[PDB]
Amino acid sequence: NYTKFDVKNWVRREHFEFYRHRLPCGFSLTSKIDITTLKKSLDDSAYKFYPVMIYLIAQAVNQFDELRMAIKDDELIVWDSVDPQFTVFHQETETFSALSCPYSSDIDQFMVNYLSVMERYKSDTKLFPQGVTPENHLNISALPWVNFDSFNLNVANFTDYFAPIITMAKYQQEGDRLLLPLSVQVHHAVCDGFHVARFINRLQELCNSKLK
Amino acid sequence: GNYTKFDVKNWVRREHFEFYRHRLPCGFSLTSKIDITTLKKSLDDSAYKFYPVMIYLIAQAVNQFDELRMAIKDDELIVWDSVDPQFTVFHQETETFSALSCPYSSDIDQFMVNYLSVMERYKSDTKLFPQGVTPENHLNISALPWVNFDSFNLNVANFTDYFAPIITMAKYQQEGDRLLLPLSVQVHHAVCDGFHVARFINRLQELCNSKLK
Amino acid sequence: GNYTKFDVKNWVRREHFEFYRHRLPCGFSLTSKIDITTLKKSLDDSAYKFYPVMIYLIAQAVNQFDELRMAIKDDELIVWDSVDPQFTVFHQETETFSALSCPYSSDIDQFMVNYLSVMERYKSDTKLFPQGVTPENHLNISALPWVNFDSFNLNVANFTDYFAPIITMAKYQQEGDRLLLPLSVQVHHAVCDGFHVARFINRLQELCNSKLK
Numbered sequence: 001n002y003t004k005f006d007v008k009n010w011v012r013r014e015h016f017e018f019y020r021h022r023l024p025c026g027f028s029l030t031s032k033i034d035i036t037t038l039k040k041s042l043d044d045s046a047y048k049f050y051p052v053m054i055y056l057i058a059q060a061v062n063q064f065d066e067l068r069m070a071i072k073d074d075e076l077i078v079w080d081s082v083d084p085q086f087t088v089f090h091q092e093t094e095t096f097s098a099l100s101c102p103y104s105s106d107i108d109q110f111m112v113n114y115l116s117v118m119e120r121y122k123s124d125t126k127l128f129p130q131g132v133t134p135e136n137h138l139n140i141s142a143l144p145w146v147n148f149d150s151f152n153l154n155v156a157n158f159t160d161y162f163a164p165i166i167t168m169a170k171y172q173q174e175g176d177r178l179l180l181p182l183s184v185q186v187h188h189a190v191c192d193g194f195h196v197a198r199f200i201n202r203l204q205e206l207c208n209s210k211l212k
Numbered sequence: 213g214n215y216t217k218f219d220v221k222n223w224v225r226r227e228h229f230e231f232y233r234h235r236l237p238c239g240f241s242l243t244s245k246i247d248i249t250t251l252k253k254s255l256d257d258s259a260y261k262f263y264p265v266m267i268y269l270i271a272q273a274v275n276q277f278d279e280l281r282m283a284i285k286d287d288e289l290i291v292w293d294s295v296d297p298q299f300t301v302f303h304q305e306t307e308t309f310s311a312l313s314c315p316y317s318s319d320i321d322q323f324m325v326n327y328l329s330v331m332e333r334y335k336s337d338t339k340l341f342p343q344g345v346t347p348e349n350h351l352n353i354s355a356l357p358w359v360n361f362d363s364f365n366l367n368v369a370n371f372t373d374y375f376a377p378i379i380t381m382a383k384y385q386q387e388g389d390r391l392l393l394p395l396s397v398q399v400h401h402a403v404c405d406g407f408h409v410a411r412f413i414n415r416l417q418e419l420c421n422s423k424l425k
Numbered sequence: 426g427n428y429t430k431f432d433v434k435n436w437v438r439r440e441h442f443e444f445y446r447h448r449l450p451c452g453f454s455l456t457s458k459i460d461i462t463t464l465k466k467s468l469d470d471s472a473y474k475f476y477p478v479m480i481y482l483i484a485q486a487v488n489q490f491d492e493l494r495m496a497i498k499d500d501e502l503i504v505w506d507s508v509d510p511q512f513t514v515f516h517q518e519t520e521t522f523s524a525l526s527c528p529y530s531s532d533i534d535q536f537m538v539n540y541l542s543v544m545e546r547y548k549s550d551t552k553l554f555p556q557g558v559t560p561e562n563h564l565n566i567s568a569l570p571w572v573n574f575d576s577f578n579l580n581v582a583n584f585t586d587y588f589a590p591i592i593t594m595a596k597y598q599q600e601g602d603r604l605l606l607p608l609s610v611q612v613h614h615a616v617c618d619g620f621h622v623a624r625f626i627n628r629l630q631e632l633c634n635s636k637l638k
């Protein structure tokens with residue numbers, strides 16, 4: 001569930017109106033995450049790369065209100081917590097589906113939740129096997145077959161859609177660092193450059209930290 | 213060219229097609245670096261030039277995959293049997309470009325005959341479309357050889373039902389022991405997922421690493 | 426300021442202007458790295474700070490090229506004699522930004538006078554546009570100094586007839602013995618092709634590598 005944001009006392013109330021109504025826009029930015037440390041943490045564990053990245057991304061998002069915003073009854077709200085909606089691939093059809101699972105700050109509980117959803121739905125070729133996407137969501141996708149330096153979604157109508165869209169590519173070694181490309185796409189009504197940078201820098205810190 | 217009506221009812225992506233055509237219309241771009249170390253070395257011995265060879269290889273990779281030859285015709289999904297490249301050419305005298313097309317052939321020598329013929333007839337014409345209207349069965353290829361980029365994205369005001377891939381290359385540059393060509397690929401999500409764009413780029417990489425004859 | 430009414434009928438891009446304004450309305454972004462190794466050394470013997478110097482050099486390069494100073498005014502294409510930078514200013518206390526403008530000068534010292542004056546008058550003002558309406562003859566410049574990026578693109582719902590370039594710079598980063606500044610340039614294709622954007626980036630690179638004094 002959610003709270004109504006106090007727009008009238010917000011430092012960004014002018015910006016919110018401006019980028020929602022006067023100059024509606026968002027932006028994407030693609031950055032490399034250094035996963036050198038994370039790969040060492042992983043290689044010494046039983047967790048898999050994609051669910052760990054999902055967990056760390058969702059953890060970072062759940063720290064920052066402006067990454068959990070939405071419009072409900074034409075008012076700005078903030079979800080208390082958001083769950084990741086992530087894509088999965090079906091090699092037999094060469095199609096993908098979107099699944100979600102409950103976020104938990106505990107990585108072991110997260111992994112339980114994830115592996116359970118995968119067990120039930122990993123072969124289901126419906127686009128949305130679980131039915132309606134949780135309203136409190138953040139979108140995560142990977143393209144593990146190719147490296148990219150840039151990714152951008154051209155959406156014909158993004159009116160009042162404020163959930164961040166995160167896309168990863170195939171990681172690759174670049175000199176002395178193992179680098180994961182990560183695109184983050186937001187609506188400027190709720191996120192400026194500073195908030196996106198804060199998110200990325202926090203995710204980088206999480207990748208460089210003990211997993212638990 | 214010739215086309216066939218696609219069987220959407222029996223398509224594994226039937227649901228995705230409706231979703232990304234009607235519910236959430238969108239496409240995406242991505243920019244990837246192609247390793248052209250082997251190609252540049254191959255081209256050192258070739259009668260043919262870098263840009264027309266890249267056009268040929270891009271067109272060959274596109275022609276391999278049905279989802280990169282899709283269109284709406286008469287408000288139904290079709291697949292072109294084959295698509296022809298429409299490429300941009302620069303005019304040094306005016307600092308303007310034109311778009312030319314030529315018939316695709318899987319045989320590089322025949323392609324280059326076709327390419328040279330179009331260039332001979334039209335290369336000095338400063339009209340945007342010297343040949344008249346773009347053939348319906350087309351891909352778009354452009355080069356920006358004057359600057360290296362890591363990103364390129366087209367912001368198109370109305371891309372409704374436009375499914376032909378748009379390919380843009382930057383100035384190549386050396387990165388450690390490889391020569392890398394930045395290549396941007398922009399598609400519509402109704403017909404192409406990340407898998408299909410990745411498959412295209414990786415196939416193109418294979419073709420760049422292939423013998424020219 | 427002063428502007429001229431552009432002769433579209435005798436323009437070499439008459440047909441491109443029509444095409445990308447009306448037939449296929451679009452623009453593009455592209456992100457490139459600027460080598461600021463020389464500039465950074467230049468600034469180690471200067472009182473001038475990195476951000477205003479970059480504003481100056483970007484504005485200087487834009488002011489050299491007519492196609493980066495275009496607009497629609499009284500429903501016709503015009504060229505501004507000169508454009509002034511509108512730049513984003515960050516307020517650390519609130520973690521919000523404002524947009525400020527100051528007059529462009531070809532003299533770096535006068536430009537810095539102009540910049541420091543506006544900062545003194547308005548740096549504590551949290552309004553988005555403290556000075557009032559953006560000057561009609563403007564260029565937009567933003568910094569995003571907190572994170573390095575290789576791509577940046579603005580997804581603008583309606584960009585009809587907006588021809589002023591949008592320039593965005595990231596956190597600079599050391600790569601070997603080069604210090605690289607990511608720079609995104611986003612234009613309308615009606616007034617700028619790949620050639621002009623490349624020409625702008627390369628000119629900026631040349632200015633960064635030149636004496637400031």
Ligand SMILES: CC(=O)OCCNC(=O)CCNC(=O)[C@H](O)C(C)(C)COP(=O)(O)OP(=O)(O)OC[C@H]1O[C@@H](n2cnc3c(N)ncnc32)[C@H](O)[C@@H]1OP(=O)(O)O
Nearest residue numbers: 261262263300301302309354355357382383384618619620
């Ligand atoms: C947004 C947007 O897309 O706008 C741009 C619109 N498009 C245009 O303006 C058209 C641009 N096209 C061109 O300039 C030319 O068609 C192009 C790419 C230079 C090819 O010219 P061309 O037919 O004479 O054939 P090429 O031999 O391939 O090119 C001439 C030289 O440029 C070199 N070259 C071609 N493409 C590239 C590249 N991407 N990076 C670096 N060098 C290049 C090529 O290797 C050759 O070099 P050398 O002489 O050292 O061997």
Ligand SMILES: CC(=O)OCCNC(=O)CCNC(=O)[C@H](O)C(C)(C)COP(=O)(O)OP(=O)(O)OC[C@H]1O[C@@H](n2cnc3c(N)ncnc32)[C@H](O)[C@@H]1OP(=O)(O)O
Nearest residue numbers: 048049050087088089096141142144169170171405406407
């Ligand atoms: C436009 C757009 O967004 O389209 C994409 C649409 N989405 C899709 O098509 C779904 C793509 N997703 C997938 O393919 C799978 O979810 C994905 C990413 C491979 C994860 O699969 P998985 O859940 O079985 O779990 P993982 O162990 O993390 O991944 C499987 C393997 O790939 C490796 N891997 C996963 N992600 C990456 C990556 N980004 N780069 C390099 N290697 C990777 C991982 O190391 C493991 O290989 P090894 O066992 O040999 O070490």
Ligand SMILES: O=C(N[C@H](CO)[C@H](O)c1ccc([N+](=O)[O-])cc1)C(Cl)Cl
Nearest residue numbers: 087098139141153155161165238406
């Ligand atoms: O469509 C989705 N994912 C795709 C996968 O390629 C993509 O990441 C995307 C995400 C969000 C989106 N949006 O909200 O506009 C559009 C595409 C989810 Cl809505 Cl299932």
Ligand SMILES: O=C(N[C@H](CO)[C@H](O)c1ccc([N+](=O)[O-])cc1)C(Cl)Cl
Nearest residue numbers: 300311352353354366368378451619
């Ligand atoms: O306009 C074209 N090419 C430009 C050159 O900058 C660009 O590559 C482009 C391609 C396709 C396009 N579209 O289909 O939306 C828009 C721009 C061709 Cl359609 Cl002529």
Ligand SMILES: O=C(N[C@H](CO)[C@H](O)c1ccc([N+](=O)[O-])cc1)C(Cl)Cl
Nearest residue numbers: 025193513524565567579581587591
């Ligand atoms: O909105 C502005 N700047 C933002 C900062 O994130 C961005 O650089 C931007 C610039 C121009 C623009 N436009 O003209 O469509 C949209 C966003 C200025 Cl108009 Cl104040």
Ligand SMILES: [Zn+2]
Nearest residue numbers: 017020021022
């Ligand atoms: Zn309003």
Ligand SMILES: [Zn+2]
Nearest residue numbers: 443446447448
């Ligand atoms: Zn018209």
